[PDB]
């Protein structure tokens, strides 16, 4: 965390 979501 965090990471790419888009």
């Amino acid at each position, epitope marked *: 965390a*965090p*990471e790419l979501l888009g």
Partner: antibody
Framework: QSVEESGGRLVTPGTPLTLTCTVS????????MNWVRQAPGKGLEWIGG??????IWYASWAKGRFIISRASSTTVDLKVTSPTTEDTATYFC??????????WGPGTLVTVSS | QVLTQTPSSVSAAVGGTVTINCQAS????????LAWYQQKPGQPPKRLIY???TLASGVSSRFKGSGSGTQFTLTISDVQADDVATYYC??????????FGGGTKVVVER
């Protein structure tokens, strides 16, 4: 590659609702999945989304009101625990949100009313 | 993230150019994590631009994205009568949590 939402309906205020995002043509595990909503005549709002690993994020206002997870090998759900009239909106699900691999669903309409 | 689009509405004659602004509270991820969406009534949102300036697949070159960090802009050259829509910017600070701007309505003049 395509997604589609399911579960849009008339719900009473306070009764738990669960929306479902079914995908096709790609692995659910390979791409990140997002939930967006839109109240009638209002703007788009990012609710939350899940990454490739499995971890989940929510918007600041959406913390607690929404629960996102994978419910199938091919599905991603969105449970609103205590729906109110403010939650009446078209809920969208989408592969990604930003990169060129992005594909949205048609959207499912939720009406919170008694 | 809180992104603000001002003004809320912009106008042009059939053939003109409009400028749609988008300011972030703080800088987006890598200074260029910003996308633009188009939503005509009834349809689901259409992604036009990502990476601040990069045109999406198939989108016309009439739509021009520019900006870095906190201030961004969507320019629409040669406005068609068909461009009646609300445009939203999409940003992120840490690439996970996203946020849409308020939207800017495009009014075609006549």
């Amino acid at each position: 590659q395509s997604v589609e939402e399911s579960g849009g309906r008339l719900v009473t205020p306070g009764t738990p609702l669960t929306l479902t995002c079914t995908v096709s043509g790609f692995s659910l595990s390979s791409y990140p999945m997002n939930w967006v909503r839109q109240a009638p005549g209002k703007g788009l709002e990012w609710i939350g989304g899940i990454g490739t690993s499995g971890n989940i994020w929510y918007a600041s206002w959406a913390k607690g009101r929404f629960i996102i997870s994978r419910a199938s090998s091919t599905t991603v759900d969105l449970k609103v625990t205590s729906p109110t009239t403010e939650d009446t909106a078209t809920y969208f699900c989408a592969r990604g949100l930003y990169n060129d691999y992005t594909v949205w669903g048609p959207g499912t309409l939720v009406t919170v009313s008694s | 993230q809180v992104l603000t689009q001002t003004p809320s509405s912009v106008s042009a004659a059939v053939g003109g150019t409009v400028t749609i602004n988008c300011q972030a509270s703080q800088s987006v991820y890598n200074k260029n994590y910003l996308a633009w969406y188009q939503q005509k009534p009834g349809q689901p949102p259409k992604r036009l631009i990502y990476s601040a300036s990069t045109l999406a697949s198939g989108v016309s070159s009439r739509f021009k994205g520019s900006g870095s960090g906190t201030q961004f802009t969507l320019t629409i050259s040669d406005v068609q009568a068909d461009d009646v829509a609300t445009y939203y910017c999409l940003g992120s600070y840490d690439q996970a949590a996203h946020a849409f701007g308020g939207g800017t309505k495009v009014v075609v003049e006549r």
